[PDB]
A paper describes a structure:
Methylaminomethyl modification of uridine or 2-thiouridine (mnm5U34 or mnm5s2U34) at the wobble position of tRNAs specific for glutamate, lysine and arginine are observed in Escherichia coli and allow for specific recognition of codons ending in A or G. In the biosynthetic pathway responsible for this post-transcriptional modification, the bifunctional enzyme MnmC catalyzes the conversion of its hypermodified substrate carboxymethylaminomethyl uridine (cmnm5U34) to mnm5U34. MnmC (formally known as YfcK or TrmC) is a bifunctional enzyme responsible for the final two steps of biosynthetic pathway of mnm5s2U in tRNAGlu and tRNALys, and mnm5U in tRNAArg. The C-terminal domain (MnmC1) catalyzes the flavin adenine dinucleotide (FAD)-dependent oxidation of the Cα-N bond in cmnm5U34. The resulting imine intermediate is (presumably) non-enzymatically hydrolyzed to 5-aminomethyl uridine (nm5U34), followed by S-adenosyl L-methionine (SAM)-dependent methylation to yield mnm5U in the N-terminal domain active site (MnmC2).
Here we present the FAD/SAM-bound crystal structures of full-length MnmC from E. coli (ecMnmC) and Y. pestis (ypMnmC), and an FAD-bound crystal structure of ypMnmC. In the ecMnmC structure, out of 668 residues, only residues 15–17 and 664–668 could not be modeled. Our structures show that ecMnmC and ypMnmC bind SAM in an almost identical manner. Most interactions between SAM and the protein occur through van der Waals contacts and hydrogen bonds with backbone carbonyl groups, including Phe-67, Thr-69, and Ile-157 in the ecMnmC structure. In addition, the side chains of Phe-24 and Phe-180 contact the nucleoside segment of SAM, shielding it from bulk solvent in the ecMnmC structure, although Phe-24 is not visible due to disorder in ypMnmC structure. FAD interacts extensively with the C-terminal ecMnmC1 domain through 16 hydrogen bonds with side chain and backbone atoms of 10 residues within 3.2 Å.
Author numbering: -7 to 14, 18 to 663
Amino acid sequence: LGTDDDDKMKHYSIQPANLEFNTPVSRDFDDVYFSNDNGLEETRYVFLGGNQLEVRFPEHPHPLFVVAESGFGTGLNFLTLWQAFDQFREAHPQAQLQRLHFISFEKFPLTRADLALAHQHWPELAPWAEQLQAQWPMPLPGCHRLLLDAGRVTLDLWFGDINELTSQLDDSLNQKVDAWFLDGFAPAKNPDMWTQNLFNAMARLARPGGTLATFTSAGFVRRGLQDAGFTMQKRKGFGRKREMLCGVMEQTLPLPCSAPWFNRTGSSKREAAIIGGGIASALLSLALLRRGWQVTLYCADEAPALGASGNRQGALYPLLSKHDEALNRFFSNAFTFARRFYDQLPVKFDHDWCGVTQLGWDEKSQHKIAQMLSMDLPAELAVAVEANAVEQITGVATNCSGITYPQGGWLCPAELTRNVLELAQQQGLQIYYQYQLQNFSRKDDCWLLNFAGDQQATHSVVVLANGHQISRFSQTSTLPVYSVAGQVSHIPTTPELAELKQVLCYDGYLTPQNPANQHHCIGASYHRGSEDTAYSEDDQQQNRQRLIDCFPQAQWAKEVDVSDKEARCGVRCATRDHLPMVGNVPDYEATLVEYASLAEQKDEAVSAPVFDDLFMFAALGSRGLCSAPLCAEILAAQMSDEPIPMDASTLAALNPNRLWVRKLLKGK
Ligand SMILES: Cc1cc2nc3c(=O)[nH]c(=O)nc-3n(C[C@H](O)[C@H](O)[C@H](O)COP(=O)(O)OP(=O)(O)OC[C@H]3O[C@@H](n4cnc5c(N)ncnc54)[C@H](O)[C@@H]3O)c2cc1C
Ligand SMILES: C[S@@+](CC[C@H](N)C(=O)[O-])C[C@H]1O[C@@H](n2cnc3c(N)ncnc32)[C@H](O)[C@@H]1O
Ligand SMILES: [Cl-]
């Protein structure tokens, strides 16, 4: 034992569908995706009509409707639903139902090319089809979220085998699905996907009273779903087909609580105070406002992005890893989500998706790159680059190989934070600057916040998104986060340095010029356990010098000029395991008492001891531009008892009580 023999069976890319036309036909399955002339009206009859969506929409007593689907395929069901939802909202703008959520699972996703071709056969759907195509995700495993129409429609595509994926979903998703679209290839010649495990999962995820519909009337499917707990009914088939099936969950099933120590719970309340001013608090605000939360932001400073989020140019690429499975999945999916989110964001901020190139300057660095190169990632995520091609790619001669992230680049985090915050204010965010939270206590049924002035406010929900100062409250004092101060030097461009087309990562990082500035940013110093933001001359020199040590023959590297003493200093908040800390704020003392002997009383274990209606968005390290968007989704979903776009184990890797609970589990 102890060998890497497993690695040859692991895959970090999902493979696309083998498509042909005549209508899209699957080569692998020898079936059509849908029927030829009548595909659109059949879709409306089977999936919309069989779940009685038109009747239910105007009386639906929740602001969200959640449809879940087996087998996304062409997207026809999704597009047809969206169209119907849009028509519903126009006819009944006063209805409580304001937002659509669609969760689909897909083993063989279409390429962007095939998807665009499939959609050509339905010019009626083109306004919706085009928006889908604009965000169609890179085929990586697991959950991919697309905010469509500014969050009015949300699409979670889970890439992989549906029968592997269903047991990977978080508990939060149970009893949340209003309607099932049980699609797939005709049972009698894809029996493989129509399993009991599938039907049971559908039953688990179904809201009590929730529906399902399907095209087939195969006996074994009817009985399988009855055994899962749905009340099933035969209804007339569209066209030639004599019969289809629909069902209702007419009972309340026992709610699952495996791993209660990782329970992500939400809140019933809809007004929140956020303690922040940085990227995290900014993106969170958007995510909460689009759901009709009342949001108040408090910031200690005179203006926002004076914390760690205040640089002029930060790099955006994912931290990949061969050994940390959860770190790799998080950053890969956060990264591509971050790119879609930033593309869609109606806010001006200086950026350029010019690519990021990491360089093998060292034996130690070549080896970390080689580790990453030995995973089969899609080229669109990360791809090797020879030494000869590096100069063509980056613009500069580095004299060594590397790996490039072609969808990566730089953005201006200070401006992004300010302009997002300014958008949130137009959407209703109340900001109070020069409000430094000292304290908060539970009074009656509110959180009482005490600011440094004898100022007080009361709020229903409090979210701590205050960077390195996260652990300065008694209810947070024992979080395993630590401060890392650092300095990024601002440098003028030269003729040699104006040739840089990309962000270079080495023992440090160098951005290309911001053409509006004629300046690059180059960093960064790393001071573990320091909260000191004073300008350091040694750090400044060292930001130049590290670059020169990595590429000793590079005449462009010597043209870096730090003599202006221009720099920016901030304090990162990090964890040993490099993942964020996002979720309920855990009660340390109550965790330790309640899970004292957890190593042998797992079965009787209570829900994770947390503070009520108190959340945190924290520890973004030096990769917050990459991680904040998806973390904003996760937290705001969790807070709202809405579908979280991540698998259970990656969520557990992001839970704030994780260190304590890991030790307590193993008895230590
Ligand atoms: C040197 C350096 C280089 C970096 N390089 C990169 C990079 O290349 N790529 C990248 O993606 N990221 C980079 N980062 C940033 C990293 O992503 C940070 O972790 C990120 O900016 C964290 O943002 P935040 O919103 O969590 O916290 P912050 O930006 O630190 O914001 C904290 C906010 O909380 C407020 N606050 C604190 N205490 C209180 C209080 N008690 N009451 C009210 N308000 C309070 C502060 O006013 C502040 O506005 C870098 C950061 C540094 C310092
Ligand atoms: C009939 S198509 C789906 C319908 C789609 N909305 C359309 O109109 O084109 C069937 C889909 O099921 C998918 N599928 C088959 N087995 C699967 C599995 N085990 N997990 C996830 N998807 C699967 C296929 O990839 C295919 O995309
Ligand atoms: Cl930055």
